[PDB]
Amino acid sequence: PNDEATIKALDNVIKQIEALSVIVNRSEKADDAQILGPNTYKQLLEHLFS
């Protein structure tokens, strides 16, 4: 056996495992709530007589 291929294979598999073990899962999504604004009731036309 060529002892220099085993070392390279071990290094490669160790690098793969180390790379796979650093990935993090973090999400910073917003919320579905809607910001509300001010409003004023409007007046419908009316007629007054006595």
Binding site: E4, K8, A9, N12, V13
Partner: protein, 51 residues
């Protein structure tokens, strides 16, 4: 022998085969590599790996 032997799904073969085809690409292994890649249809990768 404890896990991932015969029952392993075909999806796991990519990881296992990578080391073998990395070993086959070094100097001094060109005869076996050529014979293996030339006749993959008759002797597949899975039977070679099992052997």
């Amino acid at each position: 022998p404890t896990r991932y032997g015969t029952s392993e799904s075909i999806d796991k073969f990519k990881i296992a085969w990578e080391n073998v085809e990395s070993v086959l690409n070094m100097e001094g292994n060109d005869f076996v590599k050529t014979i293996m890649y030339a006749y993959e249809d008759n002797f597949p990768k899975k039977d070679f790996y099992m052997m």
